[PDB]
Each structure stands twice: as C-alpha cells, then as structure tokens.
C-alpha cells in the first residue's frame, strides 16, 4: 500500500498535508499473503514506541516527513508488552528489555529480569533454536553488549539478566553456574548455542574464564576460537567475511561494552526549553570509523545468512535507542532511532527482492520521551531542538527523579511486511508474535 | 479478523497471554471493501492516545482484557496531527482541539485555536456541511458543551476557539461578530448549520442575547427554538423524540457546562504512588440519573438518522477523556474513556448489522498520561491504582509544572470497520481522514 507516505504537498493548503496517494483497499487487498515466510528479520528498537517515531521523524524528516524504512510497512498493529509478577504471576504493566524479549522468542510471559524463563524459572526455547533446529541459518545482531537483554533472550535460559560471564552467574544464577551443573553463563550459553552470524559488542565478558567444562581457564574468546569460531572486531574485518555457517560462524565484537551512538548532544535539563539555546545534533567524535554501522552490520549478515536455501531467520536490534532515552539524550536517542531505519531499509530492499521475506519492525517496550510545546514548564528535563523544517521541537523526560528515565507501559506500534504480515495488524500480544513467526516459517 | 482480542487463557503459561486465536490473513482479507459506505460514525476520544486506551484496559479489564469496543476494530494504523505555526506556515508539533479537529473536518492544516479556517483565516466546508449538501442526515454528539472545539469544528468558522457566543466574538473574533458582518458565533453558526441531531452540554451560552439579524434581543436558546428545534434537556425528552430531520431538528441540551464525569477518585499527587494508597474509582455520586450517557446519546442519534435513506453523518466525542488527562485524574480519565467503549459498541453492532456503516475511533492527540513501574519516584503527578487484576497501576502526569498538564506530539492510533477502511492502516495524517471520509460516502 505505502511507499510514499511524505506529505503531497504544501502542508498549508488543502491535501498538501496528505500522505496517501489513492485508497489503500486494492493494494492493501495485494500485500495479504498467507503462504510460508522462508526468510524473517525482525528489527527492534529498544524503547522505541510511536513517541519515538515521532520525535525522530519531526528531527531528522521534519513533521511531514517520512521514514523510508520505519514507516515503509505496510501492516500495522499495536501490542501489548505487559511482564509478570514472579510471586503472584500477576501482570506488572511496565516490562523490562527481559521479559520482553523472552515473550516474543518464546511465547511465554515471565517476570522481569527473567532470560528465557517463565516464571518458574522453568526454560522455554526461542525462535532462534527452534531455527537452527529445522535446518535454518540463524542471526543476532545488536549495538548493544551481546550479552545485553534483547540479543540475548534468543541464545540464553537464565534467571537474572545480570548473570553476563562466569563471575556473575556463580553469584545471581547460582542454579545455571556451570560449576553448579547449570548450562552457563549468557555469554557461554551463546556461544553454546552457535548462531550462524553474531554481531554486537560486549568483548569484556569475553575476558572471563570458564570456571568448568572442557574449556576451563581458557577465556571465553579462547573458547570461541576453539570451538571453531570466526572472530572480527571492525567494519574492515566484518567485510572480509566470505562465509558464515556451522562450521565457520561469525562472531564480532566491536566494543568493549555497547557500541557508541552516532549523535552527540547535550543531555536534557530542568527548564531546559527555556532558560537553553534550542539544539542541533552533531556526529559523535568518539565513534571511529571502524566500529560498523547497524545497517552494515545488518547488511552483511543478511548476505551470509541469504547463502542457506533453507533459509533464514534475523534478529536486528537499534538498542541506544533505549539507553539514550534512560539517559534523557534527545540527540543521541533520535541518531539511534535514524540508525535503525537505515538497519530496516537494507531489510526491506532485500525481502522485496527476494518476494518470501517477513520484515516486523517493532519495540520492546514504550518510554520515557514526550513532545511537548515549545513553551512547556515541565517539572522533568526538557530540551529544545532546530527540526529539520527549521522549527523547534521541545522533548520531555518527566517519569523520574533518579539519575534515569523509566519505560512505561502504553501499547505500541508493530508493524510488518511479508508472508503472514497480515498477523500483526489489530490489537495483539508481545506473545503472539512467537507464534507468528514460529508459523509463518513453518516450524515445530 | 477481531471479535475477540483477550488472552486466550492463562497468561503465566505459553501462549495463554496470546490474543490471536488464528491467521488473520482471511479474515483480514475479507474485511477489505472499497464499496461505498452509506453511513460513517466518527467516534473521537478527545486526548485518547495509545497510552490511554492501555491504562483504561488494565484498569478496567485488566492487562490481558479487550475493550469489547474500542479495542474490537480490525484495520489499524497510527496517524500524525501536528498543527501549523499561524505566522511562518511551519508545523506546531503540539496541535490543539480545535486545529486537530479543523484537519478531519477540512482536510487543511490550520493554527491552533482555530476553527474551519486555514491559517490565511480562509473559510473552508466541513464534511457535515459536504453530508448536508449531498442529502445525507447529520449529527454531531459530544459530552463537552457543544461550543467545545471538537464538536464545534464541522459546524463553525471561525478564528479563536474562544469565541463562544455573541458576547466573546465581539471581541476576539470581530471579523466574526454578527455585527461586524461576520457568521457569527460558534453557538449561532451552529443555530445555522442545522444538522438533524445535535446532543452534548454548554447550555449556558444559549442564554446569550443575539445583539444583531433577525433574533436579535432573544436568548440563543429562544432562537433555537424560533427556527423549529425541538429542545431536549434531560435522558427522558431525548428517549421521547421519535424524529429529527431538517423540519424538526434536534438540540439536546444536558449540562450548562460539560456533561459531569461518570467516575470520582483523587486528582494524582506529588510521590502519590508511594505516600499514598492504591485507589479504587467509584461512580460520580453528581451525576444525576437524568443525564444521557454516551452511549445512550448515541444511540439515539443513530436511531434518528438511520431513518434517512440516503444515509447519515455521525460524529461522537468522548470529551472529558481529556479533560481528567488535564486535571491529572485517572479515575476521571478512565471512566471516561470506559464511557466511550460503550458508545463504540453501540455504533460497531449497528454498522455489523447494517453492513455499509464505516466506524472510525480515534484521538485527535496524544497526551500526558504514562504509564510507570508502582516504585517510580516521579517529578510530577503519581497515583496507584487497584487494576482489576488485583495488580497495582502507576499512572505519571510529569509534563507541566502550570496546573494544567499538556498535550503531547505523538502518533497515535487510528482504528476502523467497514467499507473504505483499510485507508485507516499504515502511516497517515489526520487530514487524510477528510479526504477517506469524503471519499468513502461519494460527496463531491
Ligand atoms: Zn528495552
Ligand atoms: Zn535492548
Ligand atoms: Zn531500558
Ligand atoms: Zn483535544
Ligand atoms: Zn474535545
Ligand atoms: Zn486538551
């Protein structure tokens, strides 16, 4: 149905302001299939509800602008992303990156903080390995630590979030200790899992030795290398890569702990809307040119993983968006949120192309970001911004008094293109859509 | 595809949080009709942004509930609405009632504070003077005083919200003050506009003078009176009226102001979640039993002008939604959102059972309500609540330090059943409903 949905014209006179070009019925009727999806992406952008979409349009496309990619999906829906109370097993509105990223990779609810766990901290397996299981390449990449919530709620079955390596996992997931007969740590359990293609950060972890196993006292990177992995650490080793498979998986740690944002601007502040001289984004210093972009991350692997005739199944995550958003970073939080959709445009010329791929861009949870009136006396930290129609946007972070912004529960958009796109539109659950990936590629 | 979107079962299980009790792509598919529509009901909920239809489904059907109205519309997609800076022609991020409700009604962007005029302050025809025109019966029902923005935008130009009646045109609006040579006031335009029913509040600007034409002298109330309305004020008149056409149109008068709230509970507090008890909302014991509720009002509408065979024009507000969103009172806000569901059914079993009804339910902007974890140490206004899964809500109010909280950029949700309704799905612009509507009945 869409492709163009940028206003007609002059947003001042009668239809100028108008994003459709004719009725959507016909061409909406053309876009319903319900044969098999041999490929799925699924891109998410931690915390990034229609609040974000918004502001980073408004910014970076101006209000009648239009998101190439982000907004170039033709079905629409929103969905619920609520977690639970461990104790009770009584919804807690305002999930974590955990618990939500268990529910779509497994199909199950849980409490937050839970990696691939229900609430009875009883294991579920994800999308991932019931992928590679039915003979599928499978992918996770993401800007964020590896070990980090989103990309590792495909690869992990653990107890608390925070159990990254063996030394915290000995500490707060006792039970999945190696040593105490438990599968491991995120980052062991990830590289037990073996996805074809990995990309992310998180190269610390790897520092860590296995404190049992056939690997003890080896690093877990000394581990990867001997169990066969291919490890690149920039943009010029990740090109390189001719093949990745079973036998020669790719691994890429491009920093330490997550990969820097690409935007640079000052934090919000108290009546910063006011007492502050509005702001324009500029590009991030400290982010070398050697640290990938997620669309070249998301590049590559869709050409490594294109290879398998099977097919495929990617995972692509814009995960500063978040981070940013906790830090009331309007720069930096919308850079993200242009980085990603940069991440979905590859994706979609690619399922195009191709005809049998599902791309599903959605997030996790909502946030804290609002955009609110240039004159607004917010209690929060607020901060004016030079849009890109030369008119000032004002965004608010008002939901905390500590030293972050929390998520928040309000539904948000999923939206979808592709085989079985037609699942996502109306209202459904962050559950669902485990079960409707599970189904549009045919698995067990 | 909808019908119901409640967690299959037991949401601690796999898949019992799970919506989706199939495959959409049929049923979706066979849901798309680009067959003219005969009818179109326009369900409006003012401030109702995704956030809002979450907090009001938790709390009222909990976290895995579903609106039986509201949340039963199959096609789906999220909407831009920003207004438009009156000097330089740039967007306003944050719109208002009346610029909002001038875009759906019009089909140009407008300033804020404007009603049916472009920012040169151009007059142009709303879709229930383009319903009129055509032969097709109109109404236009609301729960706010009728000289509110949002029901007052498809009946009036004119170029301040404010100009209420005769007296306040004079002055902020004397290009418009009937002396003056203009239209007149928003009460008196609507006098002329003369659609067949018109239900809401705002009975005390009818006891204005008009000060020139032909009843001048005479109250507005007495005018409408003189010009063959028939006046209804309370629930037992309005269930008397066996017809309204344009020989005996209809006025319901219910409240001097807006209609009263249907639920009371504490207005959000400064650390409320924490310094304060979980509340419980409980009816509004004001409220009389003689005052029509949404639903009722409706209802009625419905009956009176399905009864024109060239088919009808319906637009309903559900106003207060924001109004409570203002004065940060969840209780209000909720039982007024719970207030416009009812309505929605009312207009759903009619448009299932007639088949060329086209029902749209959406907001025209988002707000501040959000939605945070039950230990949030916010800025602003907090209050818990006891959902009705015996869970606790946090609800945050934290955009506005003035004792009104703001409207926020947002997109939201746009929500439709019937012929012409898949224009309703991806990205659109509030502007673009104009152009479906005015399509989907055949108006010139
Ligand atoms: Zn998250
Ligand atoms: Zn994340
Ligand atoms: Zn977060
Ligand atoms: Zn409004
Ligand atoms: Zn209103
Ligand atoms: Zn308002």
């Not at 650490?233 to 944002?261: C, H, I, R, Y």
Request: proline share 4%; aromatic share 4%; glycine share 10%.
């Amino acid at each position: 149905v869409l492709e163009n949905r940028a206003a007609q014209g002059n947003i001042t006179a009668p239809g100028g302001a108008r994003r459709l070009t004719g009725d959507q019925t016909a061409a909406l009727r053309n876009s319903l299939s319900d044969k098999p999806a041999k490929n799925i992406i699924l891109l998410i952008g931690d915390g990034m509800g229609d609040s974000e979409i918004t502001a980073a349009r408004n910014y970076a496309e101006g209000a009648g602008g239009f998101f190439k990619g982000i907004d170039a999906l033709p079905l629409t829906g929103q969905y619920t992303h609520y977690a639970l109370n461990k104790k009770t097993g009584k919804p807690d509105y305002v999930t974590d990156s955990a618990a939500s990223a268990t529910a779509w990779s497994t199909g199950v609810k849980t409490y937050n903080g839970a990696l691939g766990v229900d609430i009875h901290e009883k294991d579920h397996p994800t999308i991932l390995e019931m992928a590679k299981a039915a003979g599928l390449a499978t992918g996770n990449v993401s800007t964020a630590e590896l070990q980090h919530a989103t990309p590792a709620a495909l690869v992990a079955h653990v107890t608390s979030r925070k159990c990254y390596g063996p030394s915290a996992t000995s500490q707060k997931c006792p039970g999945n200790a190696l040593e105490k007969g438990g599968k491991g740590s995120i980052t062991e359990q990830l590289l037990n899992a073996r996805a074809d293609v990995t990309l992310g950060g998180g190269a610390k972890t790897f520092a860590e030795t296995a404190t049992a196993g056939e690997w003890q006292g080896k690093t877990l990177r000394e581990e990867a290398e001997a169990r066969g992995y291919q490890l690149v650490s920039d943009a010029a080793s990740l090109n390189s890569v001719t093949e990745a498979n079973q036998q020669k998986p790719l691994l890429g740690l491009f920093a330490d702990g997550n990969m820097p944002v690409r935007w640079l601007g000052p934090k919000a502040t108290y009546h910063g809307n006011i007492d502050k001289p509005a702001v324009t984004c500029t590009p991030n210093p400290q982010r070398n040119d050697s640290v990938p972009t997620l669309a070249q991350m998301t590049d590559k692997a869709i050409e490594l993983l294109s290879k398998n005739e099977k097919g495929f199944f990617l995972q692509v995550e814009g995960a500063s968006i978040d981070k940013q958003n906790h830090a009331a970073n309007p720069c930096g939080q919308i850079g993200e949120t242009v980085d990603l959709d940069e991440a979905v445009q590859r994706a979609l010329e690619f399922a195009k192309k191709e005809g049998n791929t599902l791309v599903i861009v959605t997030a996790d949870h909502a946030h804290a970001s609002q955009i609110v009136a240039p004159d607004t006396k917010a209690p929060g930290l607020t901060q004016a911004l030079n849009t890109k129609d030369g008119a000032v946007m004002v965004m608010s972070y008002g939901n905390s008094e500590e030293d972050s912004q929390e998520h928040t529960g309000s539904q948000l958009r999923i939206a979808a293109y592709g085989p079985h796109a037609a699942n996502v539109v109306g209202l459904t659950d962050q559950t669902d859509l485990f079960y409707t990936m599970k189904a549009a590629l045919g698995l067990k």
